[PDB]
Structure formats: structure tokens, C-alpha cells
């Protein structure tokens, strides 16, 4: 029954209270909850902003500060936050060069954030959107329409975060956003389910030596279940599935703020191919020892090179989690030198902190 | 079974090759294994060295770089390395300004590092030892005479790391960390045992809602087992122990390189009292959601306040782990101003990475 909690309702309030006290560079708003940079609104720069359910700490609150999100809106555990929150947070942050909302591809997320955008626009806030759909595993899942948005969102909020910092304009930020989205590819597996505190119970149960192949970060079914054979052949088929399911034509929508409405944009993903250069994120889903991650990364560099991918940068650790899940995801983001230029640019947030 | 591993005898190699490939700023030696800064020997400053059993990552190799350790020696999972490894690694890093052995208080570590000290010296390397015993919970344990060396090692590694970088002499370095060791206090709990991959079975087992209070990082028994009432009783009675057991008299043993023998030195710890200033490290032992660590941190500050302790700095996350155990430890390191100065100083290692 083994979570470190108090009252099963008080979870988020205690954690968010502690997060605020952990980091004076952060502000916790009450009535409603949202979190901003302690120095917001930052006059002069595109205020960048994101959110979703709690339970994937450090995403998204963990990435607030210089070089990254201006602020974040956490919902309940595994629930998108509600428009009122997103609205108000987006207004607390607004610097004067508009507001860019990054959004993961989930029905809840999409619905609430979309209603929040219109609400903002109706107040005369320049605002526009980026949708993350990296997870190559299944299509139209149990909380998503199309491909789910997972770990690549961290990469993007960093890269975009940095353009925002430098002084790029709203449309520049947004297309950096959307370009990068057609270039990251993610997959995830579980050997043990997460348990949402309020539920009491695990959220799928696995037989012995079975993995959920292509699991999602809210504990969703994946491609299948199958025998966990070895770390080696887990990474192999993950990597294969990344290549194989790479190719992807689909329709997204962004907020055209000039014409005040949702604009369909059909768009395409190329498979990673021999000759590509990537950033690699080996990401812990919650409760996988850091040590095994390095075993994962090990095989990953072997697979990449066998197919002519060059890892330029990596991150290994707990970046986009799922409560106490046992498993990990591999994100691979295609880059060129501007992208790397953006990566190496300073960031100063509690969960990511390199730079002058 | 939930181990991201291949063959049980390769796990360590696999994982070290991953740490190598992921960190080109580090160098993996073989026959025997050890890890150094890709830029050592660094002519000019006190070389800083530590090690011990694998299975605590990021400790110790995740702490190899400018501002911190010059190299590390990993052994098997939960097994101190043999002195030949410590020896050669220490010769790989010799600054020409002495070598500082930071040694965690365990039977096998004291014995192996102590012997390596003597080997180095008979080879005409200046060398001395700091010995870490922070765990307030048990006197003599499965693997330790006296108090066990836990998470405070990481604080001390970094504060002494920074004095080295500055320029401070072998001696000030050793005196620094020796002062520090008498100021840090630590106590951990576990709601689930770690499993070592070679044993295949949990290193211990609790009943439902029962916890090992004052556990150790190789899964050694605590003070007792006790029902887990809540996060709040748990943090409260951890904090009472750091008070109740802060006061402690023991004999530690440092190497006098001038006399070429072990000068035995008696010394006392002073329990934290009102008006003390502290660095706080809420530390995941391996499988606690980052989310939950903040809830602990929340309760931790409420206690530091009513007790009159003023937290100046904090770290939250997986700093000193025990494979996949579910729990956390707290470290409080009593500080003054020159201490903080060294805390804020830069550091560029795979797992701590701040400053210019």
C-alpha cells in the first residue's frame, strides 16, 4: 500500500507546498493552483507555458525558469488542469510578446487547453499552440485521439524554451515547436504498473515476466503484453518500433490568432534514417534504478550506430515519469546545428540546470 | 522480477559501458575497472577519490568532474572494491598535490581503502583519509563497526570537492571533510527491500504497511520494524532521532602520511540545536516518486522551523541510492558561511552540475 503520503486527498497540496518551499525562484498560486517564475511577468520575452496532470514530476513544474517554461499548470494526478487555471497562469506570465502553450496530445489536455486559448484570445492576448505527439506506440488510445504526447515534450520545452529566451518571436517559437514535434520519436515499456494514490490499486496488473510494450505515461495499454526476455531485446524491439512506426501522416491544429480560429494543418513525420543526428533521452518512468538506465543507454548507442544515427547529446534519468511505474522510455530527437546551438544554451530550472 | 538486465554477470559491465558512452568527459579503465575524469592527472590540485560497492548510483561515478571527484572505484553490487583497484585509480589521478580518500564507514571499505592508502604511500604518494559516518540509526550493523556512511558522503564530496578546486592543500581538504563529517546527520527508512541482481531475491521483506525504520543502504536492518502510519509520523520520528541520536562519541582513524602510521582520533558529534543553519538533502533510495520526496521536504521544513533550524540550501532527488529500494533518507548538514561559499561554487559532474 506503499506510498509516502498523508491524507489521500492532500497529496498534491503537500507536494506543491514543498515544491514551493524547495525553490524560492518559483511561485505557487492559491485559488487556483498554478506555478510561475517568481519574477513573472517577464517583460520583453515570449512567455512560454505548459501543463497537464500531475504524476509525471518533474514534468511540467520541474522545468520552470530561465531558458524554459515561464509557468506550468498541474492538474490533479493524471488529469488535465481546467481552463480557469491555464487562463490565469497564462495571464500571470504574459510578458508582452504573447504566450505560447505547449500541449500534450490527450483528449483532456487538448479540450481544456483549447478552451483556455480561446478564453485568452477573447481577452486580447496574443497566443498560439504546439501539440506534442511523439509516442509511436498505438493510435487513438484510452485518453488520446491519435498519438500520445510523452517525453519529447521536455526536449521541446528546452529547445523552444531557449529560442524564447534569446528573443525569437511568437511565430518563430511556434514553428520551432512544430518542426521539432515532427522530428522526435518516443516509446515506453513497463514491468510494473503505477498506482494512483486515490485509486488504492495498481492501474493494470502484469503477469510474471511480462511487459506492457508501448505503455503510455498514464498507465495506458500499449501495443501488447509479451515476455520480458532481456534488457537487450527490449531495447532492440523498442528501437525497431521507433524506426518502423516512424513514418506518420496526420492532421494537427494550431491556433491562428490573426483569424481567431483553429486551423487544420496536415503534416508529416519522416522515419529516422541512416545519416541522421539525434538527441537521445533514456527516461525513467518512475521507479527504475538509475543504474539500469545506463544498461539501456548502452544497447541504445549500439543500435543507433548499427543504423547510422549519431547521438550528439543525451539525458539519462527521471524526466517524464509516471507515478511509481517500473519501466522507461527512449526518445530520439533529430537535430541539426541550430538545434544543438539551442540545446547548449543556458537553462536554470530545478530539473535541468546547465549554462552560464 | 523487474530487472532491466541481461546476464546476471554482465550487468555491471553493460552499465559501465553505458556510463562511458554517455559521458565522454569520463574514462573507463579495464583490468581492472575504475573511473576517472578524462582530463587526469590534473597537475596542480589535491586529487579527490572515492568508491565502494555498485548499486548506489549516481554515487560515486556520477560525481566525477570539476568541482568534485577526480575518479571513482566501483566494486560489485554492494561490495567494496579490492585495494589494487583503489591503488591504480589513485595513481591514475595523482595531482602531485596529494590524494584524498573519502571512505564510507563499512568493514570492507575501511579495510580495502585503508590497505590501498598504505600501498600508495609505500610508493611515495602523499595520501590521507576522510571517513564518513553519518547514519545516526545503529551502532555496529551487518557490514559496519560503529555508524554507517550514507548520503552525507555526497554533500561532503562536493564541499571538499570545491576546496580542492580553489587550490586548498591536501591538509585543509582533509581537515575540511573531517569537520564536515561531525556536522552531518542522517537517517533513512524503507517501505520495500532492494533486490541485488545476483541473489535474485529481496535482500529483506516487510509485512503490509510495515517499514524498516533507520534502514541502511545495503539493506541492513534498522532500529526495528514498525507500522507505517503516515508520511507525517514517519518524517517526525526520523527527525526526532536526528535530535535524540545527534550526540555521539566515537574513535575514527586517519592516515598520518608524515609518520607513516594510523593516528587514531577520538571525537564527538554535537546534536543540531536551535539557531543552527543547515543544508538539507531529502534523498531517494531508489524507487520513491520524485513527487513524494517533495511531500517529505514539506514536512521536513515544518520540523526544522519549530526546532529552530534554518535551512539555507537543499537537494531533493536520487543522490545516494540502494538499487530499487522504496524509501528515502534525510540528511542535515550544519553549516556556516565559508561552507555555503563552497556549496555555491561551480560543479560539473554527471549528477551535480551547477555554477559558472
Amino acid at each position: 500500500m506503499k506510498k509516502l503520503i498523508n491524507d489521500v486527498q492532500d497529496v498534491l497540496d503537500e507536494q506543491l507546498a514543498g515544491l514551493a518551499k524547495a525553490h524560492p525562484s518559483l511561485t505557487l498560486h492559491q485559488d487556483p493552483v498554478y506555478v510561475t517564475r517568481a519574477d513573472a511577468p517577464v517583460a520583453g520575452k515570449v512567455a512560454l507555458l505548459s501543463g497537464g496532470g500531475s504524476g509525471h514530476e518533474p514534468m511540467h513544474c520541474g522545468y520552470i525558469g530561465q531558458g524554459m517554461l515561464s509557468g506550468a499548470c498541474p492538474g490533479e494526478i493524471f488529469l488535465s488542469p481546467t481552463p480557469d487555471k491555464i487562463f490565469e497562469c497564462a495571464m500571470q506570465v504574459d510578458g508582452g510578446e504573447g504566450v505560447l502553450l505547449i500541449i500534450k496530445n490527450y483528449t483532456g489536455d487538448i479540450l481544456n487547453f483549447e478552451t483556455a486559448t480561446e478564453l485568452l484570445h477573447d481577452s486580447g492576448v496574443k497566443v498560439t499552440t504546439v501539440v506534442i505527439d511523439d509516442d509511436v506506440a498505438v493510435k487513438d488510445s484510452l485518453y488520446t485521439a491519435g498519438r500520445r504526447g510523452v517525453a519529447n515534450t521536455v526536449l521541446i520545452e528546452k529547445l523552444v524554451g531557449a529560442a524564447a529566451e534569446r528573443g525569437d518571436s511568437l511565430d518563430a517559437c511556434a514553428e520551432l515547436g512544430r518542426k521539432l514535434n515532427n522530428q522526435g520519436h518516443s516509446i515506453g515499456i513497463a514491468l510494473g504498473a503505477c498506482t494512483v494514490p486515490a485509486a488504492g490499486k495498481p492501474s493494470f496488473t502484469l503477469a510474471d515476466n511480462e511487459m506492457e510494450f508501448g505503455v503510455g505515461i498514464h498507465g495506458e495499454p500499449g501495443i501488447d503484453r509479451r515476455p520480458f526476455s532481456s534488457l537487450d531485446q527490449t531495447v532492440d524491439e523498442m528501437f525497431d518500433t521507433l524506426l518502423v512506426n516512424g513514418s506518420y501522416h496526420r492532421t494537427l491544429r494550431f491556433w491562428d490568432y490573426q483569424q481567431g480560429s483553429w486551423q487544420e494543418e496536415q503534416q508529416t513525420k519522416q522515419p529516422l534514417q541512416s545519416g541522421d543526428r539525434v538527441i537521445a533521452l533514456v527516461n525513467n518512468l518512475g521507479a527504475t534504478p538509475l543504474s539500469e538506465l545506463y544498461g539501456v543507454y548502452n544497447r541504445l548507442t549500439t543500435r543507433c550506430q548499427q543504423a547510422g544515427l549519431t547521438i550528439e547529446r543525451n539525458l539519462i534519468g527521471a524526466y517524464c515519469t509516471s507515478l511509481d511505474m517500473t519501466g522507461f522510455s527512449i526518445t530520439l530527437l533529430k537535430v541539426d546545428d541550430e538545434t544543438l546551438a539551442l540545446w547548449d544554451a543556458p537553462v536554470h530550472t530545478p530539473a535541468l540546470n546547465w549554462g552560464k | 522480477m523487474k530487472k532491466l538486465i541481461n546476464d546476471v554477470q554482465d550487468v555491471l559491465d553493460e552499465q559501465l559501458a553505458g556510463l562511458a558512452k554517455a559521458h565522454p568527459s569520463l574514462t573507463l579503465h579495464q583490468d581492472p575497472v575504475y573511473v576517472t575524469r578524462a582530463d587526469a592527472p590534473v597537475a596542480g590540485k589535491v586529487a579527490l577519490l572515492s568508491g565502494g560497492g555498485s548499486g548506489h548510483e549516481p554515487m560515486h561515478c556520477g560525481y566525477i568532474g570539476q568541482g568534485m571527484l577526480s575518479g571513482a572505484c566501483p566494486g560489485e553490487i554492494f561490495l567494496s572494491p579490492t585495494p589494487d583497484k583503489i591503488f591504480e585509480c589513485a595513481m591514475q589521478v595523482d595531482g602531485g598535490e596529494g590524494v584524498l580518500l573519502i571512505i564510507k564507514n563499512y568493514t570492507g571499505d575501511i579495510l580495502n581503502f585503508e590497505t590501498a592508502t598504505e600501498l600508495l604511500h609505500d610508493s611515495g604518494v602523499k595520501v590521507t583519509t576522510v571517513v564518513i559516518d553519518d547514519d545516526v540509526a545503529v551502532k555496529d550493523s551487518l557490514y559496519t563497526a560503529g555508524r554507517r556512511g550514507v548520503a552525507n558522503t555526497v554533500l561532503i564530496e562536493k564541499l571538499v570537492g570545491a576546496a580542492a578546486e580553489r587550490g586548498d592543500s591536501l591538509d585543509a581538504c582533509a581537515e575540511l571533510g573531517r569537520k564536515l563529517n561531525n556536522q552531518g546527520h542522517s537517517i533513512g527508512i524503507a517501505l520495500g527491500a532492494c533486490t541485488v541482481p545476483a541473489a535474485g531475491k529481496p535482500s529483506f521483506t516487510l509485512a503490509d504497511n510495515e517499514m524498516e525504520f533507520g534502514v541502511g543502504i545495503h539493506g541492513e536492518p534498522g532500529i526495528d520494524r514498525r507500522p507505517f502510519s503516515s508520511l507525517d509520523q514517519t518524517v517526525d520520528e526520523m527527525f526526532d532521532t536526528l535530535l535524540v541520536n545527534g550526540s555521539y562519541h566515537r574513535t575514527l582513524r586517519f592516515w598520518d602520511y608524515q609518520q607513516g602510521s594510523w593516528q587514531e582520533e577520538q571525537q564527538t558529534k554535537q546534536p543540531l540545536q536551535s539557531g543552527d543553519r543547515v543544508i538539507a538533502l531529502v534523498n531517494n533510495l531508489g524507487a520513491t516518486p520524485l513527487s513524494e520526496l517533495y511531500g517529505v521536504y514539506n514536512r521536513l521544513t515544518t520540523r526544522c522551523q519549530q526546532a529552530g533550524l534554518t535551512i539555507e540550501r537543499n537537494l531533493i532527488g536520487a543522490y545516494c541510492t540502494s538499487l530499487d529500494m522504496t524509501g528515502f533518507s534525510i540528511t542535515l548538514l550544519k553549516v556556516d558561511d565559508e561552507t555555503l561559499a563552497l556549496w555555491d561554487a561551480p560543479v560539473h559532474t554527471p549528477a551535480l552540475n551547477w555554477g559558472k
Binding site: - | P32, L79, T115
Partner: protein, 294 residues
């Protein structure tokens, strides 16, 4: 045993019983220093173990000396046994810690501070179930574990003398270290004190209350044309013939201060200026003679 019991609670947490990996061995160049660091223990030990084996052959067993970390410094005894042990990875510089090879006398004696025998399925690792190992730890001048003596033989063959055999040798080697180094010290304090007398301005000669030569320094040797070695303990009056001044001063126990005096060494006459001092004691009265260099 309660001892073996704890060993197992330690082993069990981190290792299984059916597995066996070639135990870590220290590589060549660095084994060099490992061995060198124990010239003194190893040369006591191998004299002790050669003799043991001398009066034990034929028999199937092996004798080890290990250092404080369970590194095998040298091995001797039955060739075939050594090779059978080798065939399990037991070699020069192999590490024999409990963590490496589980519960065994080889590590357990040092762990517990006293001779210990393990055999058969008392060993954690199955691969060692037809062995018996006895080992006894040894300590240093201070009180620090410094090495082990072990004996290994197929289990069906252990005898009740095996343990005390390793303890007897552990005691020889241990006690010789302590007292050999007490000798060393008091020997260094001699060279020191001798070099002092080697360094005077004066020639100095001392002798027994029985008139035998005790000390003579290069200086006084040259002056009196004595040869330092061949002179010792020889009676002074058969060494050289003495002035009535000396005779009467010796006989009368009376110091002489800067008195002029003429010695005769194997026919040759030597004029010298000498101070002579009685050295009063229960055995009798000794003398220094100082030959002052004009």
C-alpha cells in the same frame, strides 16, 4: 556455529550458492607492490610453510599466506592440490574475500579475529563443498590484522591437527614479526649511537672489568695501530703494553685528565695524551680512555 550463521546472513543478501565466478585477481605489475609490502611476513612465512610441508609430504593439501585483504601472496604444498585449487581460480594475487567467494576460513578467520575452520557445506559456495580450509589471522606491532595462514585440503581428509597447525605457524610468524622489529629498532639505535662515537674528535677505547676490549673507534684504532674487528673482546694488555701511569691509574681506580702517556703496540711506540675514566658498577669497574688529538 553462530559465526558461520552470521556469515550466511551476510552472504545471502548479495550472492547465491550455486554460482561461481573466477575470483578477482590482482594484475602482474600491481601484485608486485602487493608482494613487496610484505618482504618481512613472507620470508618468515615461507620458511615456516616449507618446513611444515617438508614433514608432511606426501599428503594432499595446500598452504597459503594471505595478506589482510585476502590476497594470495604465495602458495605452497602438494603440487596437485594447488593445481586443483587453481582450477577454481585460486592463484597468486587472487582475492579471497567473503564477498568474492562467500563464507570461508580464508576470509572468516580474519573477520572473526581467530583461527577458524570451515568445511563441506558450511561453505556458502557449492564449488567448495568438498573442501576444508583452515586459516589463522596474524597481527602487527600495533595490533592490526596483517595477514593469514591457511591450509586447504579435500574435506574427507581434514584432521584435528590442521587448525592448530595453521595457528602454530600463525604464532611463529606473528611473534617473529613483533620481536624481529623490536630487534630492528634496537639495532638502529646502536648504529646511531655507534656513529656518534665514530664521530668524536677523540679516539675512544673502552674495556671490561676483566680487562677485555669492549669498544674502539676508527680514530683510536689508527692511533694505536689496532685493527678494529680482530681487536674486540681481546684483553687490552695482550693488545698493547701499558704505561705505569695507566697501570697505576687502572689499578688505583683514579681518573687521569689530559695526562701524557706512551703506548706500545706490537713493538711500536706511540706518544699520546689521554683522559681515563672509571665506570663504576656491580659487576666491576670499566674504563674509557680518550686519546685526545694534540
Amino acid at each position: 556455529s553462530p559465526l558461520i550463521a552470521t556469515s550466511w546472513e551476510r552472504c545471502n543478501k548479495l550472492m547465491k550458492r550455486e554460482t561461481w565466478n573466477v575470483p578477482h585477481q590482482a594484475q602482474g605489475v600491481t601484485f608486485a607492490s602487493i608482494y613487496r609490502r610484505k618482504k618481512a611476513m613472507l620470508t618468515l612465512g615461507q620458511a615456516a610453510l616449507e618446513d611444515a610441508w617438508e614433514y608432511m609430504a606426501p599428503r594432499e593439501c595446500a598452504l597459503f599466506i594471505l595478506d589482510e585483504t585476502a590476497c594470495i601472496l604465495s602458495r605452497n604444498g602438494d603440487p596437485q592440490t594447488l593445481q586443483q585449487l587453481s582450477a577454481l581460480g585460486f592463484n597468486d594475487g587472487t582475492y579471497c574475500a567473503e564477498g568474492i567467494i562467500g563464507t570461508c576460513a580464508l576470509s572468516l578467520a580474519a573477520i572473526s579475529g581467530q583461527a577458524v575452520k570451515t568445511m563441506a557445506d558450511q561453505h556458502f559456495k557449492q564449488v567448495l563443498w568438498n573442501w576444508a580450509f583452515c586459516a589463522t589471522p596474524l597481527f602487527d606491532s600495533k595490533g592490526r590484522l596483517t595477514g593469514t595462514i591457511a591450509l586447504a585440503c579435500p574435506v574427507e581428509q581434514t584432521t584435528a591437527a590442521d587448525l592448530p597447525l595453521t595457528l602454530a605457524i600463525a604464532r611463529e610468524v606473528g611473534n617473529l614479526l613483533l620481536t624481529d622489529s623490536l630487534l630492528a629498532e634496537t639495532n638502529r639505535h646502536l648504529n646511531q649511537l655507534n656513529a656518534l662515537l665514530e664521530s668524536m674528535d677523540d679516539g675512544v677505547i673502552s674495556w671490561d672489568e676483566q680487562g677485555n676490549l669492549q669498544f674502539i673507534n676508527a680514530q683510536a684504532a689508527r692511533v694505536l695501530r689496532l685493527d678494529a674487528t680482530a681487536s674486540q673482546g681481546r684483553a687490552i694488555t695482550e693488545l698493547l703494553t701499558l704505561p705505569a701511569v695507566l697501570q697505576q691509574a687502572i689499578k688505583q681506580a683514579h681518573p687521569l685528565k689530559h695526562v701524557e702517556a706512551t703506548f706500545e703496540s706490537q713493538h711500536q711506540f706511540i706518544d699520546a695524551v689521554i683522559t681515563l675514566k672509571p665506570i663504576i658498577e656491580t659487576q666491576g669497574t670499566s674504563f674509557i680512555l680518550l686519546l685526545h688529538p694534540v
